[PDB]
Amino acid sequence: FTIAQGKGQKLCEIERIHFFLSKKKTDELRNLHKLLYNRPGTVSSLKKNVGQFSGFPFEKGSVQYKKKEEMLKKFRNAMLKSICEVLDLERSGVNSELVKRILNFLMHPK
């Protein structure tokens, strides 16, 4: 495969974030790959795809950066439910801390 070949540390490099993700679950893969990759991740995909989606550790302060803040907000409640369950987190902090985490994590995990 070759979904990542330049990102300093894509979802597959960051051992911390890449690790918690190695424990993907059928249900989790259902929502994560259904919207993130818009595809029914299988075995070699859900594994590589998740670790290699697009490039979480990208750049912020850009038109898209703010964009995520919104979509990740509504998802903050739902997405974190499943995502947080397996996204290097333990479900904690307040709403403002959850979304703020998507801009500091989904926009720059590491």
87-95, Cβ contacts within 8 angstroms, sequence gap of 24 or more = 87/17, 87/20, 87/21, 88/16, 88/17, 88/19, 88/20, 88/21, 89/20
> Which technique was used to obtain these atomic coordinates?
NMR
d(CA 1, CA 74): 32
With a CB cutoff of 8 Å and minimum separation 6, the contacts of 82 are 27, 28, 31, 32
**Closest to 28 measured CA to CA, from 70, 79, 74:** 79
Q: Which two tokens stand for residue 60?
A: 């912020």
